[PDB]
Amino acid sequence: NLSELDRLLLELNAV
Amino acid sequence: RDAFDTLFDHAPDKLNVVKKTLITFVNKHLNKLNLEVTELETQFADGVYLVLLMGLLEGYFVPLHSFFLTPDSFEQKVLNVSFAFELMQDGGLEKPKPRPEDIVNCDLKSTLRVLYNLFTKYRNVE
């Protein structure tokens, strides 16, 4: 299982 | 402040991605107990599923005398949630950010934070 959730949270953390 | 504050403030349109992922994860496990969540907003608020999910993920048998299977008051629900938080720390998770009351009050941010921390720790459990 891969999850777009992980990338989403990474991107939000960067903001 | 964390990524969940930024989620609600700056990307609330992505909430469905978050909830779908977490719902899929929790049901993978709860289904083994003939249990099923259809909405994250309300169905963890009484603490029962959280207690049961931890016992399952950690392989602890949680005795019924330890919690309230059918809570009938705010305080019984708070006690369930607190015990679930205790089990999380027994599993090696850090202390949760939300108060147990925040979960009982159906605070979505709090609910997501709690389920996400389970997800990240237990994502590989078959």
Author numbering:
A (entry chain A): 1 to 15
B (entry chain B): 247 to 372
Sentences from the paper on this structure:
The adaptor protein paxillin contains five conserved leucine-rich (LD) motifs that interact with a variety of focal adhesion proteins, such as α-parvin. α-parvin (Olski et al., 2001), also known as actopaxin or CH-ILKBP (Tu et al., 2001), is part of the ILK signaling complex (Tu et al., 2001), plays an essential role in adhesion-dependent PKB/Act activation (Fukuda et al., 2003) and in the regulation of actin organization (LaLonde et al., 2005) and Rac activation (LaLonde et al., 2005; Zhang et al., 2004). It belongs to the highly conserved parvin family that shares a common architecture composed of a variable N-terminal region followed by two CH domains (Olski et al., 2001). Our results demonstrate that full-length α-parvin contains a single LD binding site, formed by the N-linker helix, helix A, and helix G of the C-terminal type-5 CH domain.
To elucidate the molecular basis for LD recognition by α-parvin-CHC, we cocrystallized α-parvin-CHC with peptides representing the high-affinity ligands LD1, LD2, and LD4. The refined structures include residues 247–372 of α-parvin and paxillin residues 1–14, 141–155, and 262–274 for LD1, LD2, and LD4, respectively. All three LD motifs bind to the same binding site on α-parvin-CHC formed by the N-linker helix, the N-terminal part of helix A and the C-terminal part of helix G, which is consistent with our results from chemical shift mapping. Surprisingly, however, the orientation of LD1 is reversed compared to LD2 and LD4 in the corresponding crystal structures. Despite their antiparallel orientations, however, the binding modes of different LD peptides are very similar. The side chains of their conserved leucine residues in position 0, +3, +4, and +7 interact with a hydrophobic patch on the surface of the CHC domain formed by residues from the N-linker helix (A249, F250, L253, A257), helix A (V263, V264, and L268) and helix G (Y362 and F365). In addition, two positively charged residues (K260 and R369) of α-parvin-CHC are in close proximity to negatively charged residues of the bound LD peptides. Note that these electrostatic contacts involve the conserved aspartate D+1 of the LD consensus in the case of LD2 and LD4, whereas D+6 and E+8 are utilized in LD1. Consistent with their similar binding modes, all three LD peptides, irrespective of directionality, impose similar conformational changes in the N-terminal region of α-parvin-CHC, whereas the protein core remains virtually unperturbed. Residues 258–260 of helix A, which are α-helical in the unbound conformation, adopt a 310-helix in the complexes.
